[PDB]
């Protein structure tokens with residue numbers, strides 16, 4: 001029976017070597033989860049039952065696992081994405097008046113549910129507010145005001161410390177910053193420094209989204225390391 | 233009209249189950265002697281998984297066990313010698329279930345890909361990829377080398393034919409995402425618990441739901457079947473484990489304590505059915521006396537939450553797999 | 564009087580280091596790339612508290628080295644080895660933190676347990692080469708009459724060293740690790756401040772200073788005063804008296820006991836200590 | 841879809857069910873009869889134990 005034991009030990013050694021190689025490969029890559037709404041525009045972002053996209057930037061491998069279908073209000077599978085580097089959230093900021101409760105309020109509720117999750121008490125969320133151009137068109141020219149669908153907009157004023165675009169209107173900047181603050185309040189209330197939210201204003205034509213995700217992942221890992229050593 | 237009839241039928245079921253309650257299980261069982269303190273020490277620790285483990289399944293020989301993790305690998309261990317017999321890479325990194333065929337030739341896995349993959353060990357290529365589930369798979373079991381039962385997140389359980397690769401029959405009428413599944417020793421019946429509190433009993437051959445039990449309050453994360461074949465214990469997220477009886481049609485006992493508030497992820501029974509071993513989200517397992525609902529011991533060797541738990545067919549060993557990627561075999 | 568405090572120091576050093584080592588060894592969750600360096604540092608401090616400090620206390624109190632000349636040379640070599648190993652392990656931990664913070668994407672590839680073992684072994688081999696090789700081969704032997712009288716007699720032992728060996732040992736042990744640690748910690752402070760400014764700019768609606776202050780202040784206030792006078796007594800023969808030299812050496816020794824209190828404080832280590840005790 | 845639910849409830853309405861006392865007695869008898877061959881309940885002797 002010694003020969004069988006020796007052969008099994010040799011097989012174990014080969015499997016262990018393969019496991020070490022695969023461990024290097026696995027630790028090299030970073031995992032991201034795309035959890036936008038169906039209308040928000042996940043297709044536009046992913047263009048640049050489960051869909052996996054492997055994109056690398058600056059010799060760093062990123063894997064974005066976006067769940068397809070599975071249109072269930074209850075999300076039991078979300079506990080699987082407990083070790084992802086970040087959760088990429090895509091929200092349509094131009095849907096403040098669409099009903100198919102409003103779409104923006106549904107996105108707010110979804111973001112609050114993701115933030116206040118026991119398993120996701122450490123995972124940071126990268127926020128993309130897509131369809132900026134449509135939001136600008138609706139706020140500027142449209143006769144439907146965000147105040148009617150969001151009563152708190154009446155008392156809201158634009159922040160003193162802000163970064164308006166080089167060619168951008170005042171009222172639309174007010175609307176954009178209000179929509180950003182709506183998510184930022186939920187971000188700031190619960191998490192006590194373990195995870196943060198990175199709100200980015202994305203347009204359909206913007207191609208720098210990959211760079212934004214790379215920078216946000218770098219900041220996330222830097223902040224995690226700093227908090228681990230009590231430097232932040 | 234139809235709703236009123238359904239309400240009347242539900243009231244009739246409640247009244248009929250009330251009339252069968254001759255005496256509580258605790259009243260009968262309090263006379264028999266207690267099990268006493270049970271101490272279990274980790275005999276073997278299996279290392280080699282990178283990410284969290286969800287599922288395990290002891291082989292029929294009680295020597296080989298297969299474990300599934302988010303690494304995209306399906307490692308088959310040898311529990312006696314702590315040696316990895318096989319390490320099967322998987323197409324999809326996300327898996328949530330695994331199974332070991334009774335013959336030992338076949339191994340299955342599944343996850344968020346909605347596809348059940350069946351592997352042929354003795355030949356590690358993919359024997360068949362089973363598609364047809366709308367949602368993620370949660371648990372798989374083997375009836376024989378040709379029939380497999382999968383429970384998915386589309387609120388439907390299905391029975392497949394491996395050679396044909398088609399759903400022979402589909403179990404529908406379930407209102408929640410099925411999370412766990414277990415088979416009877418005679419393989420004639422099986423049970424399934426879902427996100428909705430109700431846990432149903434099915435008939436494999438006919439394909440209809442014979443009975444329904446709704447004692448719980450939260451998601452039914454785990455289910456196990458009593459060795460006698462006339463009972464089954466379910467673990468939910470409300471920090472309660474309950475023992476149901478097929479013949480009585482209602483629960484017999486409730487395993488819970490005020491100290492523990494976390495949900496139960498995995499449950500299993502000992503060979504004699506006296507000890508109900510249940511995993512917990514509070515980082516360690518608990519051993520419950522199934523007869524008196526008195527805890528007999530703990531299994532506090534794990535660092536992360538316990539996602540799977542099993543007992544050998546011979547009953548010699550208990551293996552628990554946690555999210556810390558370490559399989560620990562207790563005895 | 565002096566015996567009580569030195570005994571307490573020995574007990575504290577040994578107790579802290581053994582707690583750290585057994586917490587790392589017993590619990591699998593505590594085994595990490597940084598924790599391997601922590602274990603190496605704890606081992607250095609433990610061998611310090613076992614051999615270096617009790618023998619020095621006995622030499623001070625008894626006023627005579629009852630042990631043989633070979634044992635005296637061995638004690639001196641072990642002292643140098645332990646000091647330099649501890650300081651270089653602190654430098655390596657600082658470098659590991661700097662690489663983890665500054666380059667987070669490549670930190671996983673740069674640091675590996677197999678590679679961490681190489682780093683620890685290289686540190687200990689450097690410590691051995693700088694401590695055992697010159698002392699055992701008697702290359703640190705001085706030339707003046709006082710050193711000859713002290714080393715010829717086996718009853719008494721005092722540290723008399725060459726200018727070359729003293730300067731080389733000081734540079735290898737403290738000053739180079741001091742420079743490396745100051746640079747890397749100034750950098751990590753800069754990233755901490757930049758991240759704090761970024762958070763303030765994003766969420767308009769101290770800790771790094773305190774942490775780095777403790778980490779650098781204890782090390783500097785423990786070892787810099789000793790190494791300044793170590794250089795000075797060579798530079799000027801009559802500048803530094805023996806009592807001041809020994810007092811500063813023991814002040815540097817106390818750093819070994821203080822070190823776990825600053826390097827092993829964390830929720831995981833606290834939980835492990837509670838479980839053990 | 842209510843017709844399917846009411847039909848299923850009617851199918852589940854009429855099953856011959858035994859009293860809880862009989863079922864509990866059967867479970868107790870099964871636990872007592874097979875208690876001897878339970879390595880977990882009664883620790884196996886160190887000899888012939890596969891793991892230790």
Ligand SMILES: CN[C@@H]1CCc2c(ccc(O)c2O)[C@H]1O
Nearest residue numbers: 639642643646722732733736812
């Ligand atoms: C006997 N005391 C020794 C003498 C010189 C010396 C010490 C520590 C570290 C060094 O690098 C040294 O060169 C002291 O602990």
